[PDB]
Write a protein that binds this ligand. Structure first.
Ligand SMILES: [Ca+2]
Ligand SMILES: [Zn+2]
Length: 221
């Protein structure tokens, strides 16, 4: 059923704030964040080093976004290619509590354990959530199990993680938040019934498919 992460124990976890916390993201180098395309908005401030999003606790860095880049093939209806890059106006100061997470070299496999983290804010859902960072350890599901859970909706750019039994709900991730497996950012919180229904997995953007695009885009902007 997940747990309270602990302050600054997930040092790559970002809050995106446009007046309020509206999405999560992952710091992938000192000047770039990975989030979901469905998180796209104007006037983004990136907030690093957060634990309680409503209290200044001493390790925060607030940096305005320079621009956001939604994936060229993002479809807002199907959520295929649900990935967006956010450039920071200035480089974050990296330390133990604020640190980047590595992009994957290879995709992850079913059965691999991942860490999903966030404040539980899903964009435009209206759902209640806590103010401190929450965590869930969950396994990647097989392609076949994922497709069986969501018939007609899982593309090659998506994967499922979570639990099909237990009677729990998984509401930890924010829209756009990290799914980190063996020290690599493998997923982005995208969609699913995992919070609304018990025994359903989350659906995540498959980051390994996008590494070339991410690297090329950063290198040119
Ligand atoms: Ca804070
Ligand atoms: Zn919220």
């Amino acid at each position: 059923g997940g747990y309270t992460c602990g302050a600054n124990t997930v040092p790559y976890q970002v809050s995106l704030n446009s007046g309020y916390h509206f999405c999560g993201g992952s710091l992938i180098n000192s000047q770039w964040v990975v989030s979901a395309a469905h998180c796209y908005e104007s006037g983004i401030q990136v907030r690093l080093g957060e634990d309680n999003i409503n209290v200044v606790e001493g390790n925060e860095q607030f940096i305005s976004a320079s621009k956001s880049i939604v994936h060229p093939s993002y479809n807002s209806n199907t959520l295929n290619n649900d990935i967006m890059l956010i450039k920071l106006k200035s480089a974050a100061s990296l330390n133990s509590r604020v640190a980047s997470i590595s992009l994957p070299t290879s995709c992850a496999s079913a059965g691999t354990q991942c860490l999903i983290s966030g404040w539980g804010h899903t964009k435009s859902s209206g759902t209640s959530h806590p103010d401190v960072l929450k965590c869930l350890k969950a396994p990647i599901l097989s392609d076949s199990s994922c497709k069986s859970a969501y018939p007609g909706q899982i593309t090659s750019n998506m994967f499922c993680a979570g639990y099909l039994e237990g009677g729990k709900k998984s509401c930890q991730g924010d829209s756009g938040g990290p799914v980190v497996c063996s020290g690599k950012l493998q997923g982005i919180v995208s969609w699913g019934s995992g919070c609304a229904q018990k025994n359903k997995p989350g659906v995540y953007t498959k980051v390994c498919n996008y590494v070339s695009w991410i690297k090329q885009t950063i290198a040119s902007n």
